[PDB]
Amino acid sequence: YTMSLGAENSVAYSNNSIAIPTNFTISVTTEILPVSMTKTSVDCTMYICGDSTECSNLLLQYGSFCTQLNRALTGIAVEQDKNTQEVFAQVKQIYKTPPIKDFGGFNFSQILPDPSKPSKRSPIEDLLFNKVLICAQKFNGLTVLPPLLTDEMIAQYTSALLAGTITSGWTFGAGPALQIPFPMQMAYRFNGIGVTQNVLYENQKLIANQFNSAIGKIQDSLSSTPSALGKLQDVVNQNAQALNTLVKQLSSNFGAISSVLNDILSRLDPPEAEVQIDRLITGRLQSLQTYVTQQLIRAAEIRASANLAATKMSECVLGQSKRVDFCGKGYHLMSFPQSAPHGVVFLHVTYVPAQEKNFTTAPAICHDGKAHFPREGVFVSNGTHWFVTQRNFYEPQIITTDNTFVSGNCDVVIGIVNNTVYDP
Amino acid sequence: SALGKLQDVVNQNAQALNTLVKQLSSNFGAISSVLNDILSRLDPPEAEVQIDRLITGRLQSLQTYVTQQLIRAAEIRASANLAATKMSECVLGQSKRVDFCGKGYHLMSFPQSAPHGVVFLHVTYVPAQEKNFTTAPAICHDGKAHFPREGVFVSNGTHWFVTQRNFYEPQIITTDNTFVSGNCDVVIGIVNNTVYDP
Amino acid sequence: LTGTGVLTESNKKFLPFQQFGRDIADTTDAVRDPQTLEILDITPCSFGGVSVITPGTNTSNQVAVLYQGVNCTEVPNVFQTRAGCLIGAEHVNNSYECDIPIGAGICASYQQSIIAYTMSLGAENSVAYSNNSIAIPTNFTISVTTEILPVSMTKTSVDCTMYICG
Ligand SMILES: *[C@@H]1O[C@H](CO)[C@@H](O[C@@H]2O[C@H](CO)[C@@H](O)[C@H](O)[C@H]2NC(C)=O)[C@H](O)[C@H]1NC(C)=O
Ligand SMILES: *[C@@H]1O[C@H](CO)[C@@H](O[C@@H]2O[C@H](CO)[C@@H](O)[C@H](O)[C@H]2NC(C)=O)[C@H](O)[C@H]1NC(C)=O
Ligand SMILES: *[C@@H]1O[C@H](CO)[C@@H](O[C@@H]2O[C@H](CO)[C@@H](O)[C@H](O)[C@H]2NC(C)=O)[C@H](O)[C@H]1NC(C)=O
Ligand SMILES: *[C@@H]1O[C@H](CO)[C@@H](O[C@@H]2O[C@H](CO)[C@@H](O)[C@H](O)[C@H]2NC(C)=O)[C@H](O)[C@H]1NC(C)=O
Ligand SMILES: *[C@@H]1O[C@H](CO)[C@@H](O[C@@H]2O[C@H](CO)[C@@H](O)[C@H](O)[C@H]2NC(C)=O)[C@H](O)[C@H]1NC(C)=O
Ligand SMILES: *[C@@H]1O[C@H](CO)[C@@H](O[C@@H]2O[C@H](CO)[C@@H](O)[C@H](O)[C@H]2NC(C)=O)[C@H](O)[C@H]1NC(C)=O
Ligand SMILES: *[C@@H]1O[C@H](CO)[C@@H](O[C@@H]2O[C@H](CO)[C@@H](O)[C@H](O)[C@H]2NC(C)=O)[C@H](O)[C@H]1NC(C)=O
Ligand SMILES: *[C@@H]1O[C@H](CO)[C@@H](O)[C@H](O)[C@H]1NC(C)=O
Ligand SMILES: *[C@@H]1O[C@H](CO)[C@@H](O)[C@H](O)[C@H]1NC(C)=O
Ligand SMILES: *[C@@H]1O[C@H](CO)[C@@H](O)[C@H](O)[C@H]1NC(C)=O
Ligand SMILES: *[C@@H]1O[C@H](CO)[C@@H](O)[C@H](O)[C@H]1NC(C)=O
Ligand SMILES: *[C@@H]1O[C@H](CO)[C@@H](O)[C@H](O)[C@H]1NC(C)=O
Ligand SMILES: *[C@@H]1O[C@H](CO)[C@@H](O)[C@H](O)[C@H]1NC(C)=O
Ligand SMILES: *[C@@H]1O[C@H](CO)[C@@H](O)[C@H](O)[C@H]1NC(C)=O
Ligand SMILES: *[C@@H]1O[C@H](CO)[C@@H](O)[C@H](O)[C@H]1NC(C)=O
């Protein structure tokens, strides 16, 4: 079929009608980013000329090719450790939550560690690790270096970042962590997105329930959907295929009488053996150069992803972002990092407008001949009475001189309406 | 070792050039690495074979060099794009992006020229001395719920004040720095106090 | 069939006609002995990278050696870690900040002799969280942080005919 680009929605635009949300939902969006790549390493002489003095001596006629290949792979491994360090080691101190997790109704048990098991990971992190040969590869001079930061250390970093975010808001990212009650921190985040504090406090129980439910939805989504962590699995698969391809190239003859170097040396004397070995060296060297080039390009892609993940860690977790769609879909409130195999998962908590209502609007109100404009919100009408309300949440208030300002007269503003401004 | 980021780039390019030049001393299976010696000693039927071996090895070395330079150049391009972004957002403005323009709350930045690079001196505001205070989300005065307009409500243990969030500066709580929404029965943690109306 | 390796008794169920075996890598990993019909597994002789851990020559000429992915019983202050067998570094129970990375959470430093330790991720700080307590700064400092970024690379050029066929 011809694909659809989405449902059509004609917006009911007019010069005097504004829609304003009367309710909202708390949404948690999952973003998965690769951070690191498996740190492979290949001994160029072992791969090309394993246990053979004659081949190694012939290989010396190609100069420094093996040295620069080993250097390139070493540089990749170092880069992977740097990528992990830049994404996760962004907190100076290891923060811990208090024993009594009273956060004003907000439940964080799904994202905080649960020490009942030997590895102090959270349940969501356990899901990520559970969702997402070595001898056969290793035997040809292809070793794998362990990451500098172990899974337990990544979990400890995410735990520290999360404890800081919950108990200190964004203050731990700019200097010394300052303790704050979590509803007050949420009040600051609501102010950040342009919603007043009383909206949060009056609806604190509803907001806490919506948050806890959304986290549960994330738990179920990860538990159910098999292809959710495809971004990390694809990286693992690409590296596994690259190693399998490199190893399989050793079975190629490349025009030689045999792919096995030992059989050539067992059967032939140097005047013929050198020709057969040169053919094997040329093919194996070309295969190794192809592998290294692919790893450098893939590593550059991983580096770009890791830089993005580090940027999101700084701007979405250690602060509150005003960049649209950078920290999830909606108005960003806060984010929580989670460790994942070779990567990071961000749970972005966003404010999303829900229920819709039409209202009549005007750019200004004409009271005594002076033009009154709203200081913080907009002027709305329900069809009979005029009120002033904050832009992102319908909360009508009587229009007074304390929430409006005066500039000019009624003859200049197009669309100004007549009404009464009260002066308590 | 402070300027290691720039020195590493200089070293990588120097090593790449030294490696490329050193590849000319390799025989690649030829009788000699020196093209002039082959042409001085051999006639075309044998010289072409020896030269083809040298061409294959030198061409492979040059292709390897160019590929490494393209990948390194892409990395430098990414760094330069980041530097240009920081120049625009940290020097020609004030950023609200956490840790983008230094560690702390960004105030301003100053660029400095460096060999093959740029150094930014980021001037940030960092909170220093700490003090504990008792807080409340709202104050109940006449049965109405008062919320702070710009700061938070704090107490030193006996008196309640309103202060800006990032610097302790207690002020008397008045109707000019608070707003009223709803009543005292909805806000969890509301405390009783007096709001003055000058 | 010739090669170098370690011969062990195999638990593979070879069929009566099979004379040797191969791994996932398509390399020989098992052989049937031509005199007694025993199945042997062939593993390569132990190998791995050798890395030298060192403080600079301005401070000391003492070094430590990491045998990457090798057991400490095969190589001949010997510390076996996940990264490999580290010889010459004294293992301590005191954690510190990472200086020279070894791998798998292990770092090394020169403090005199070279020591190895599990790296610290930072000092612990339990935040005094409660439902009615807020900390607010009463003073501040002005900090200048230095960030260094590469902008350009040396503009080299090579004449391909001059380089190859001067
Ligand atoms: C705002 O939306 C929430 C849901 O996002 C509403 O809460 C639901 O209210 C209905 C009442 O009809 C209950 O049956 C549901 O169980 C509630 N769900 C939750 C999660 O609380 C809330 O009532 C809405 N408020 C307004 C003023 O419209
Ligand atoms: C915080 O959330 C967890 C799970 O998200 C809650 O634990 C569940 O509690 C119910 C009790 O009604 C049990 O039936 C579930 O089996 C529990 N699940 C798990 C995974 O433990 C926990 O009770 C919540 N805490 C609070 C204070 O509400
Ligand atoms: C627009 O809002 C005003 C304010 O609530 C409404 O006026 C009230 O209407 C109810 C009817 O249910 C009366 O009981 C109140 O006494 C009215 N208050 C005042 C101050 O007049 C008005 O009805 C709304 N108009 C529409 C079309 O919804
Ligand atoms: C808002 O109110 C003013 C009066 O306060 C209206 O001005 C009147 O306009 C008509 C039409 O031109 C004149 O005949 C009247 O003489 C005007 N009144 C006065 C006192 O001069 C104005 O039209 C109103 N605007 C709207 C949109 O209703
Ligand atoms: C909280 O702040 C108030 C305001 O400064 C303090 O009240 C003052 O205390 C001093 C004692 O050194 C008296 O000399 C002043 O006359 C008091 N002023 C008023 C208006 O009462 C109060 O002592 C502080 N409380 C604590 C526990 O520090
Ligand atoms: C804040 O002040 C109100 C009174 O202004 C307190 O309400 C009293 O609560 C007790 C316990 O339920 C009742 O016995 C009194 O009759 C209430 N007073 C009135 C005038 O009705 C309220 O408890 C205070 N809150 C705090 C936290 O101190
Ligand atoms: C705020 O901090 C500054 C330093 O960051 C303080 O200035 C110092 O004050 C002490 C007084 O004991 C002097 O000995 C130092 O020489 C001062 N240093 C500088 C750089 O000025 C300042 O006093 C602090 N202010 C408050 C109110 O605590
Ligand atoms: C607003 O009015 C339009 C009619 O132009 C209607 O289509 C739309 O559904 C209305 N919105 C609400 C929330 O009632
Ligand atoms: C708004 O649009 C309507 C047409 O739907 C028009 O009649 C009216 O004059 C417009 N109002 C203003 C202030 O332009
Ligand atoms: C605040 O109180 C806690 C006690 O829970 C204490 O550990 C901390 O040092 C206090 N902070 C200051 C700045 O006095
Ligand atoms: C705040 O926490 C304490 C426990 O330390 C509790 O006694 C008190 O009732 C709580 N206050 C509110 C408003 O929940
Ligand atoms: C010689 O090889 C045959 C092969 O079947 C085997 O049966 C026999 O036992 C072998 N003899 C000795 C002395 O190894
Ligand atoms: C390095 O060694 C020189 C002596 O050759 C000495 O002057 C200098 O202070 C040393 N620097 C450090 C950092 O140890
Ligand atoms: C090294 O060999 C010993 C056997 O003596 C074994 O117990 C140990 O687990 C081995 N360690 C590793 C890392 O293979
Ligand atoms: C660390 O402490 C334990 C005691 O729990 C001890 O058995 C072990 O030998 C110590 N390790 C080192 C390297 O001193």
mmCIF file of C-alpha atoms and ligand atoms in Angstrom, chain A residues 366 416-418, ligand 4:
data_model
loop_
_atom_site.group_PDB
_atom_site.id
_atom_site.type_symbol
_atom_site.label_atom_id
_atom_site.label_comp_id
_atom_site.label_asym_id
_atom_site.label_seq_id
_atom_site.Cartn_x
_atom_site.Cartn_y
_atom_site.Cartn_z
ATOM 1 C CA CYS A 366 -10.492 48.219 27.180
ATOM 2 C CA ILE A 416 -9.554 44.740 21.901
ATOM 3 C CA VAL A 417 -12.783 44.027 23.791
ATOM 4 C CA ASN A 418 -14.723 46.019 26.365
HETATM 5 C C1 LIG D 4 -16.053 49.653 23.515
HETATM 6 O O1 LIG D 4 -16.671 50.751 24.222
HETATM 7 C C2 LIG D 4 -16.651 52.023 23.556
HETATM 8 C C3 LIG D 4 -17.331 53.004 24.481
HETATM 9 O O2 LIG D 4 -16.824 52.901 25.804
HETATM 10 C C4 LIG D 4 -17.314 51.928 22.182
HETATM 11 O O3 LIG D 4 -17.201 53.184 21.519
HETATM 12 C C5 LIG D 4 -18.467 53.563 20.933
HETATM 13 O O4 LIG D 4 -18.459 53.279 19.509
HETATM 14 C C6 LIG D 4 -19.660 53.623 18.799
HETATM 15 C C7 LIG D 4 -19.431 53.241 17.355
HETATM 16 O O5 LIG D 4 -18.416 54.042 16.765
HETATM 17 C C8 LIG D 4 -19.978 55.104 18.977
HETATM 18 O O6 LIG D 4 -21.221 55.397 18.350
HETATM 19 C C9 LIG D 4 -20.041 55.467 20.455
HETATM 20 O O7 LIG D 4 -20.231 56.870 20.602
HETATM 21 C C10 LIG D 4 -18.756 55.051 21.168
HETATM 22 N N1 LIG D 4 -18.846 55.346 22.588
HETATM 23 C C11 LIG D 4 -18.339 56.454 23.138
HETATM 24 C C12 LIG D 4 -18.523 56.596 24.619
HETATM 25 O O8 LIG D 4 -17.760 57.304 22.471
HETATM 26 C C13 LIG D 4 -16.675 50.810 21.364
HETATM 27 O O9 LIG D 4 -17.345 50.625 20.121
HETATM 28 C C14 LIG D 4 -16.699 49.493 22.135
HETATM 29 N N2 LIG D 4 -16.050 48.439 21.372
HETATM 30 C C15 LIG D 4 -16.610 47.245 21.162
HETATM 31 C C16 LIG D 4 -15.804 46.274 20.352
HETATM 32 O O10 LIG D 4 -17.718 46.960 21.606
#
